[PDB]
Amino acid sequence: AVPHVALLPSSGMGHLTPFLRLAAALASHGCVITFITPTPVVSAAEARHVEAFISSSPLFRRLEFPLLPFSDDPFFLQFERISRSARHLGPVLSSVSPPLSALILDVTLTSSILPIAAEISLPAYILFTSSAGMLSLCLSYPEIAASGTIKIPGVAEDLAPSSLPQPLRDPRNLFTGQFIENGRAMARADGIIINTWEALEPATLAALQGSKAVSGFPLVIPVGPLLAAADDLVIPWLDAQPASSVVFVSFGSRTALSAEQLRELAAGLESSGCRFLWVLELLGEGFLQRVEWKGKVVSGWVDQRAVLDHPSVGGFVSHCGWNSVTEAALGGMRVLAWPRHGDQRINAMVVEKSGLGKWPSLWTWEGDDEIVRREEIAGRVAELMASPAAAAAAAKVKEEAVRAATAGGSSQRQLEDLVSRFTCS
Amino acid sequence: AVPHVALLPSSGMGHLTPFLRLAAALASHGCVITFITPTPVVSAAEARHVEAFISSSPLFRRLEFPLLPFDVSSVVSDDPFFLQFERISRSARHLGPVLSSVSPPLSALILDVTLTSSILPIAAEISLPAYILFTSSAGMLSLCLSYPEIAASGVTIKIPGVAEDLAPSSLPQPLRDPRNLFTGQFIENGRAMARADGIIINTWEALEPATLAALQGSKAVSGFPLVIPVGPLLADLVIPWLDAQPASSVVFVSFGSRTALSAEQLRELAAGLESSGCRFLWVLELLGEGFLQRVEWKGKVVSGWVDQRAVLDHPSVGGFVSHCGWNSVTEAALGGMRVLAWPRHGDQRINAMVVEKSGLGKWPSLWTWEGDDEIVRREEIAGRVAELMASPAAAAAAAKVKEEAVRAATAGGSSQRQLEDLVSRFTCS
Ligand SMILES: O=c1ccn([C@@H]2O[C@H](COP(=O)(O)OP(=O)(O)O)[C@@H](O)[C@H]2O)c(=O)[nH]1
Ligand SMILES: O=c1ccn([C@@H]2O[C@H](COP(=O)(O)OP(=O)(O)O)[C@@H](O)[C@H]2O)c(=O)[nH]1
Numbered sequence: 001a002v003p004h005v006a007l008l009p010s011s012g013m014g015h016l017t018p019f020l021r022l023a024a025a026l027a028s029h030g031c032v033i034t035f036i037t038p039t040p041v042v043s044a045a046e047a048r049h050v051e052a053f054i055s056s057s058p059l060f061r062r063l064e065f066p067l068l069p070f071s072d073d074p075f076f077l078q079f080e081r082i083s084r085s086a087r088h089l090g091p092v093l094s095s096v097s098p099p100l101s102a103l104i105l106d107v108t109l110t111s112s113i114l115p116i117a118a119e120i121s122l123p124a125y126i127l128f129t130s131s132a133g134m135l136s137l138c139l140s141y142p143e144i145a146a147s148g149t150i151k152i153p154g155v156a157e158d159l160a161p162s163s164l165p166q167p168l169r170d171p172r173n174l175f176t177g178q179f180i181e182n183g184r185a186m187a188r189a190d191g192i193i194i195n196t197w198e199a200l201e202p203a204t205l206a207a208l209q210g211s212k213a214v215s216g217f218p219l220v221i222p223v224g225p226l227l228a229a230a231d232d233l234v235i236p237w238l239d240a241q242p243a244s245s246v247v248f249v250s251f252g253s254r255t256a257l258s259a260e261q262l263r264e265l266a267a268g269l270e271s272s273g274c275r276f277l278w279v280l281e282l283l284g285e286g287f288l289q290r291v292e293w294k295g296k297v298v299s300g301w302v303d304q305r306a307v308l309d310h311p312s313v314g315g316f317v318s319h320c321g322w323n324s325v326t327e328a329a330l331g332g333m334r335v336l337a338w339p340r341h342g343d344q345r346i347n348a349m350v351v352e353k354s355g356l357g358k359w360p361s362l363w364t365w366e367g368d369d370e371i372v373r374r375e376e377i378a379g380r381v382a383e384l385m386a387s388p389a390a391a392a393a394a395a396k397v398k399e400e401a402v403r404a405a406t407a408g409g410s411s412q413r414q415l416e417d418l419v420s421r422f423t424c425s
Numbered sequence: 426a427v428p429h430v431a432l433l434p435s436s437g438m439g440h441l442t443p444f445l446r447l448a449a450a451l452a453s454h455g456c457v458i459t460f461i462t463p464t465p466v467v468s469a470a471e472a473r474h475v476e477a478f479i480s481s482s483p484l485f486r487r488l489e490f491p492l493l494p495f496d497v498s499s500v501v502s503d504d505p506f507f508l509q510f511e512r513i514s515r516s517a518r519h520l521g522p523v524l525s526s527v528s529p530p531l532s533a534l535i536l537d538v539t540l541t542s543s544i545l546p547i548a549a550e551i552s553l554p555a556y557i558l559f560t561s562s563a564g565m566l567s568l569c570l571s572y573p574e575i576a577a578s579g580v581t582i583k584i585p586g587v588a589e590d591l592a593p594s595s596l597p598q599p600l601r602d603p604r605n606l607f608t609g610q611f612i613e614n615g616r617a618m619a620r621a622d623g624i625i626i627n628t629w630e631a632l633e634p635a636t637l638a639a640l641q642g643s644k645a646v647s648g649f650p651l652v653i654p655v656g657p658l659l660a661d662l663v664i665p666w667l668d669a670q671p672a673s674s675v676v677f678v679s680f681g682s683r684t685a686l687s688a689e690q691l692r693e694l695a696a697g698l699e700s701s702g703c704r705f706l707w708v709l710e711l712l713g714e715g716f717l718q719r720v721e722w723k724g725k726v727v728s729g730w731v732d733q734r735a736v737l738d739h740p741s742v743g744g745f746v747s748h749c750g751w752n753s754v755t756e757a758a759l760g761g762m763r764v765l766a767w768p769r770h771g772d773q774r775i776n777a778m779v780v781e782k783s784g785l786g787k788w789p790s791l792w793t794w795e796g797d798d799e800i801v802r803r804e805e806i807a808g809r810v811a812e813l814m815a816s817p818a819a820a821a822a823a824a825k826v827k828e829e830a831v832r833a834a835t836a837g838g839s840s841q842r843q844l845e846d847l848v849s850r851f852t853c854s
Contacts, residue, residue, distance in 0.1 A: 157797040160592030353791055355808055361790040362778055368589055379784055383818035389811050 003101035003422035006034045006063075006093070007127075008113065010106035011042040011078055013049075013253040015129050017323050018195055020053050021226035022104070022127060027059040029419045034096060038065035038085060042078050063096070065089060071174060079108065086112035094120050101422035104193065107138075111178070111185040118188075123421075125191040125221075130322045131350050132196045132204035134343040135220065137164075138183045139211060145171065145180060154204030155349060163349070165342040166367045190215050193418070195224035195326055197411050199400035200354055223415045225326045225401050230300030231307075234277065237296050238307070244314030244391070246295070247276040247381055248307050248333070251319040251340055259283060261371050268377030269295060274385045277313065308333055314391070315384045316357070320347040329356055332398035334390040336380055341366050355393035358384065428532040428851035431488075431524065432460045433544065435537035436467040436509060438474075438682040440560050442752050443627055445478050446658035447535075447558060452484040454848045459486040459527065461520075463513060490523055492516050507606065510539065517543035525551050532851035535625070538569070542610075542617045554850075556623040556653070561751045562779050563628045563636040565772040566652070568596075569615040570643060576603065576612060586636025587775060595774040598796035619645035625847070627656035627755055630839045631829035632783060655844040657755045657834055663706065664735060666725045673743035673820075676705040676724075676810055677736055677762065680748035680769055688712065690800050697806025698724065703743075703814045706736070737762055744814045745786075749776035758785055759834075761827030763819040765809060770795045784822030787813060 005026055009019040023033045035054060041047040054060045068088060069081035086109075093103065093116070102123040105113050110126050117124035128135050136154025144150060150159045167175035186192060191213055198205055205222065213219035238246065247269065251257070257265070263283055269276040270291055278297035282288050288297070304324060307313055308331030316333040318324050319340040325347055328335050335357030337348035348359040360380055364370050384390060404411040430451055434444040448458040460479065466472035479485045492512045500508060517540075524534065524547070533554040536544050541557050548555035559566050567586040575582060582591035599607040618624055623646055630637055640652040667675065678698065680686065686694070695713050698705045698720075705724035708731050717726065733753070736742060737760035745762040747753045748769040754776050757764050764786025766777035777788040789809055793799050813819060833840045 155791075157793070157799055158594050160590075160594060162590050162592065349791060352789065353805070358787065359790075360781070361788070362588065362781060364589070370589060376782075379818070379822060383816060383822070386818045387812060387816040389808070389815035393808055393812065 001423070003031050003419070004034065004096075004098050005031045005422065006036055006096065006100045006103045008036045008103065008105040008109060009050075010108045011046065011082070013046060014321055014323055015106055015108070016046055016049060018129050018226060019106075019127060020049065021228045022193070022195075022223070023053075023060060024228045025223065025226060025415060026419070027057070029415060031101070031419060031422065032098075033060045034063055034100070035060060036063045036065055036089075038067050038082060040067055042082075063092075065092065073174070076174075083109060083112040086116060089113065090116040090119055093117070093122060101424075102190070107182060107186070110189065111181045114185050114189060123190040123215075125193055126186055126189045128192055128194045130194075130343045131325070131347050132194055132201040132208055132220070132222070133346045133350055134322070135192065135194055136204050136208055137343075137346065138179070139186060139208075139219075140183070142180045142183045145176075153207040154201070155346070155353070159346075162365065163345045166365060187211075187219065188214060189219070191217070191221050191418070191421075192219050193221045193223055195226055195322065196222050197224050197401060197404035197409075198222065199404060200224075200329060200397070201350060203353075204350075221414055221418055223411055223418065225330055225405050225411070227330065227405060229303070230279070230298050231303040234296065234298060234302060235306065235310075238277065238310050238312050241275055241312035243311050245275050245385075246313040247272065247274055247315050247317060247385060248313045249276060249317035250279045250302065250304060250307075250324070252321040252324055254340075255280065255319070256340065256366055258371075264372055264374040265377055267374035268381060271374055271378035272381040272385070273378075274382060276381075277307065315381070317381065317384075318357075320344040320351060322347055325351060325356070326401075329354075329397045329401045332391075332394045334358075334384055334387070334394040336360075336384045338363060339365070354397055355390075356397045357394065358390065426529055427455060427457055428848065429457050429459060429527070429529050430851065431527070431531045431534045432458055433520075433534070433536040433540060434460070435513070435539045436471065438471060439750055439752055440537060440539075441471055441474070443558060443560050443658055444537075445475070446660040447625070447655070448478070448485060449660045450655070450658055450844060451848065452482065454845065456848060456851070457484045457486065459488050459531065461523075462487060462489050463516065464489045464491045467509060488523070488527070490516055490520060493519060502606065513540060514543040517547055520544060521547040521551050524548075524553060533622075538614055538618065541621065542613045545617050545620060554622045556625055557618055557621050559624055559626040561626075561772045562754070562776050563626055563633040563640060563652070563654070564775045564779055565751075566624070566626055567636055567640065568772075568775065569611070570618060570640075570645075571615075572600075573612045573615050576608075585639040586633065587778065591775075594794065594797075595778075597771045597774075598794065601796075619643075619651065621651075622646055623649070623653050623847075624651050625653045625655055627658055627751060628654045629656050629830060629833035630654070631833055632656075632758065632826070633779060653843055653847055655840045655847065657759055657830055657840070659759065659834060661729075661731070663708075663725065663727060663731050664739070667706065667736070667739050667741050670704055670741040672740050674704045674814075675739075675742040676701070676703055676744045676746060676814060677708075677742050678705060678746040679708040679731075679733065679736075679753070680767075681750040681753055684709065684748065684769065685795055686769070687798070687800070693800055693803045694806055695726075696803035697810060700803055700807035701811040701814075702807075703811055705810075706742070743820075744810070746810060746813075749773045749780055749788075751776055754780055754785070755830075757823075758783070758826045758830045761785075761820075761823040763787075763813055763816075763823045765789075765813045767792050767801075768794070783826050784819075785826045786823070787819065 054062045067081045068085045104125045133155045137152045208220045211219045276295040279302045280299045316328050316335045318335050320337050337351045337359035339345040339348040351357045352359045403409050479487045493516050535556040538557050564587040567584045584591050645651040707726040709728045737756050745757050746765045749766050764780050766780045766786050766788035768774040768777045780786040781788040
């Protein structure tokens with residue numbers, strides 16, 4: 001028979017892409033998928049992606065949940081309303097037919113929905129969007145806050161305080177309290193699902209392997225990597241460009257770069273001496289006309305997977321969002337790591353240890369006052385684009401990543417084995 | 426009369442080498458240097474090095490102050506580093522008479538930072554100008570100068586030149602415990618350094634523009650800038666083997682005078698160096714049995730003291746793996762050899778940031794310290810070492826470092842001018 005799995009995502013492309021990709025893989029291994037999407041949607045633009053994906057096949061169905069909305073922080077308001085309906089969701093889950101084999105929920109909503117799932121005796125699995133290092137920080141942070149130090153079992157004997165997400169720096173914070181809850185809450189979950197593989201984070205996972213879920217099984221389940229217009233002016237341009245000669249710089253869904261900092265990144269690319277593709281009223285009037293021959297910059301949404309797999313692009317300047325890292329790993333693009341906020345610094349550490357790319361540690365976060373000079377920016381880009389051994393190291397990540405993805409690999413085995421937990425007798 | 430300067434260096438080749446190089450530079454610009462060397466010598470080997478230096482010329486001189494006998498009941502904690510410091514520190518009071526009696530009278534006294542707390546009061550009594558020579562980098566200097574304020578604060582380190590939020594891991598491992606004699610000794614020296622008439626460093630504006638700019642601001646010297654940068658001070662089986670090797674092909678790996686690398690770690694550097702597949706001259710018991718035979722064509726590993734300056738100037742070497750001792754960092758900067766920064770202890774982690782910011786070398790932050798003991802695996806050593814040699818942009822960056830460092834060192838350069846000005850201070854009307 002065919003198991004039935006409900007997916008409860010959270011707002012934001014960074015959380016949304018993995019869920020779609022995780023849903024796609026579960027359908028490929030026979031499961032039938034029902035997305036729980038609460039209404040009204042935070043973002044019309046993100047809603048289009050879910051609609052088109054669900055529209056494509058009868059294996060996926062959409063369930064609309066009324067938000068039932070009633071510090072006044074802007075992002076938190078959406079989550080509060082998203083999390084308020086937590087109690088109400090319980091009856092709706094039981095009503096769904098055919099009976100769900102299991103529920104898979106976003107980390108952010110882990111604290112809110114885990115009791116509901118436990119109330120109705122529904123197995124609850126958490127999808128972790130981030131790296132295993134970030135997960136390792138999350139799981140052990142409640143213990144750390146009591147007696148802190150900052151030794152994260154997965155990747156740090158003493159993590160520098162800058163590497164912690166910028167909100168987490170002050171303990172008497174609203175963010176800190178929720179963070180401690182999620183970490184504590186995740187241990188109680190039936191399973192945790194991450195988009196990492198053993199080759200990419202052997203150290204963090206091996207430490208993580210010891211952690212044990214309540215239900216007689218390892219808490220953490222790695223199924224990664226998962227594989228699944230504005231580009232119209234881009235793809236033709238890229239094809240003209242020589243093989244592996246174009247720097248690609250993108251910060252993902254949220255790119256809060258200040259104008260002072262912006263001018264420098266722009267100056268660095270011009271001073272880089274290599275072609276660049278940049279995605280975001282020019283600050284320099286003739287900058288665009290002057291640089292048209294060397295590189296193209298587009299303000300719209302683009303097609304990162306096509307760009308990363310494009311032959312002409314040779315390097316990736318990144319903010320080290322976990323989804324973009326995995327996509328860069330698959331591409332084998334050497335990555336220069338400019339982590340912007342949150343878990344992005346820890347992700348940068350993963351990039352360097354893996355050999356996927358190099359991280360200028362002394363470079364600043366969004367909170368930091370100090371700007372990054374263009375001359376410094378130009379050096380690392382030119383260096384990254386000209387280092388053959390860096391390219392070769394990136395190609396090993398790709399091979400290893402594909403190996404885990406390909407059939408028989410450690411990751412596909414874990415997804416096959418996870419599915420069986422649903423096909424119970 | 427020709428200016429007469431008194432040098433009171435602390436023990437250790439890393440501290441001794443700048444003094445000697447500064448002494449030669451000062452002598453070159455018309456100075457007679459008198460070395461205050463205590464008896465009994467800490468090290469015969471260092472003492473022989475100094476004696477050979479004094480023999481070089483009539484301008485250099487040797488004067489010995491016998492260390493006062495220790496009081497056994499008084500000694501605290503039984504530590505060899507501190508006991509040696511304590512005997513030299515204890516003779517501070519005795520030192521003033523000897524200084525005044527010198528013939529001809531000394532224009533100024535220039536002393537090691539470590540002994541500066543003990544000796545600075547002596548100088549004020551005899552009205553002798555005291556300058557401290559700072560063996561380390563400007564960034565490190567910034568930490569010493571502001572560490573006392575930071576300690577009585579804190580939420581964020583924020584060393585003025587080094588960073589906004591310096592990581593605790595980057596701080597010297599002794600400093601991590603605040604209630605320590607070392608942490609207190611560190612705090613005293615920093616306070617003392619403001620009082621001093623001047624602070625000399627082995628740096629130049631080109632190398633550390635931001636950190637030096639901030640220091641220009643402190644100007645704690647009465648009526649003058651406190652910081653005087655005169656850097657870069659400039660003054661067997663291995664070479665023959667080097668000459669054979671092809672141009673810019675050899676990885677030089679050396680951790681200075683003190684290189685405590687654990688046995689488990691030692692194996693990894695060998696495997697990593699072997700695996701990288703590029704040539705390597707490794708300076709430092711058969712930890713590897715067939716390792717030397719397998720890599721005999723590729724590299725030379727020797728245990729003796731070696732002419733590092735010749736190595737770094739050699740055309741066949743292409744990359745340098747170091748512990749980022751300021752003396753080693755500055756030597757490489759003159760050579761323009763790209764560096765792979767593996768800081769081991771003390772101020773070396775701060776030095777690594779200067780190597781990465783300069784473009785002289787790349788620093789792998791995640792690499793462990795002697796304090797923490799998670800080893801660096803050979804897979805990472807091989808990749809990082811090989812990539813450094815493979816990377817042409819890294820060579821260009823180091824080449825640019827050399828040019829500016831040469832510029833400062835040559836006539837009309839920032840430092841050369843600054844050294845000239847300092848000699849004038851010693852010779853007034
Ligand atoms: O112009 C774009 C911008 C982003 N992406 C996608 O943004 C995804 C994940 O974003 P990430 O986690 O790396 O950054 P975050 O969303 O977390 O700020 C990646 O899968 C990209 O495919 C894209 O396809 N075209
Ligand atoms: O085999 C060696 C090791 C070191 N040095 C010299 O020791 C100097 C300073 O060493 P550094 O301060 O950088 O490290 P430390 O000795 O203080 O740990 C360098 O200038 C080298 O010339 C040398 O000549 N031969």
